Amino acid sequence: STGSATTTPIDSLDDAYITPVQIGTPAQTLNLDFDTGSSDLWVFSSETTASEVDGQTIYTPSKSTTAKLLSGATWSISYGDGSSSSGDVYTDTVSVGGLTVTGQAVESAKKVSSSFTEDSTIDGLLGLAFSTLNTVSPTQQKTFFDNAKASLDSPVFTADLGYHAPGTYNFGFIDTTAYTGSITYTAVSTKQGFWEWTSTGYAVGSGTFKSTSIDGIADTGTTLLYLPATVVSAYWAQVSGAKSSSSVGGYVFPCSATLPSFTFGVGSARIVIPGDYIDFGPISTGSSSCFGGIQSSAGIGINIFGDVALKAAFVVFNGATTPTLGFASK
């Protein structure tokens, strides 16, 4: 089997991407944030505290003939941005882009933190990291990809995120029309439950490439590119007037600037992030200070190849017995 679904930016900045997912019988379609940095499929629901729902579409298990309470199971998750959610668990039929999993754990939120409530466009998350990070207790549950894997034509999914445009998540096949050149594959460590890999270096603009190993995670659920402070300083030093602002929470730059590109290495290959992808717009409405899309990972404890980086590439998440990642230009 295969599946193919379009993923759409939630706003004009590509702050996140939403993909429609069918849950239950008859189908209830919710727009979920596919997140290769976590491993829980959780939704706003008829169980979510009413004051914490503000415009989201909810899953109502009592209206699904295939829903079943997973008795005794609870979940609770906290994300790197400080947001969180928790609740109980049902199993139900879940379909993405024509690919159907029966018996998928659907984690129903009883509580969500303010950032989730305040984002009316995201109805939940669909985790695509390794199932060892799933938070369901006392019986850990498998991700949608893990459950689908055996049925897929090939044990892979791909992320093809758009810049200010829709893109695609494919399951079970690699669309050879969706990228240019060849795909370069690179080793993955699953020791922390992430799609963790080692970039071979970077360049700023037209500058020379610096060969240096940068361990980090491929994380579709993180907006920005978070890299070591040395690398990030070297980037922003090429932008007149850019500075790190403790009050804003990272590097800002004059909105009048033209940003240089940023290249990262994948083995001997190179992925180029155009400068425009690094512009996250005014820090507040009407400000002439703009927020940068490359930020320091110092204090986060891991480097994160988030959407800013991934959207410049066609990315293969290869879930074979020994997982690997593939990157191609597009």
Describe the model.
The two termini are about 25 Å apart. It is globular and about 60 Å long. By secondary structure, it is mainly beta. Strand 6 (about 85-95) and strand 7 form a beta hairpin. It contains 4 helices and 24 strands. The chain is about 5% helix and about 45% strand. The protein has a 7-stranded mixed β-sheet. A 6-stranded mixed beta barrel has the order 2-3-8-4-7-6. The protein has 2 domains: about 5-175, Cathepsin D, subunit A, domain 1 (Beta Barrel); about 175-330, Cathepsin D, subunit A, domain 1, CATH 2.40.70.10.
How far apart, in Å, are the first and last alpha carbons? Answer: 25 Å
* CATH evolutionary superfamily of the largest domain: Acid Proteases
* Number of contiguous helices: 4
CATH architecture classification name of the largest domain: Beta Barrel
CATH class term of the largest domain = Mainly Beta
Biggest β-sheet, characterized? 7 strands, mixed
- Secondary structure: helix percent: under 10%
Percentage of residues in DSSP E strands: 35-45%
Please tell me what the overall shape is.
Answer: globular
PDB class: hydrolase
Keywords: crystallographic fragment screening, Endothiapepsin, ECBL-96 fragment library, hydrolase
Assembly: monomeric
Entry title: Endothiapepsin crystal H01a from ECBL-96 fragment library screening campaign used for PanDDA ground state calculation
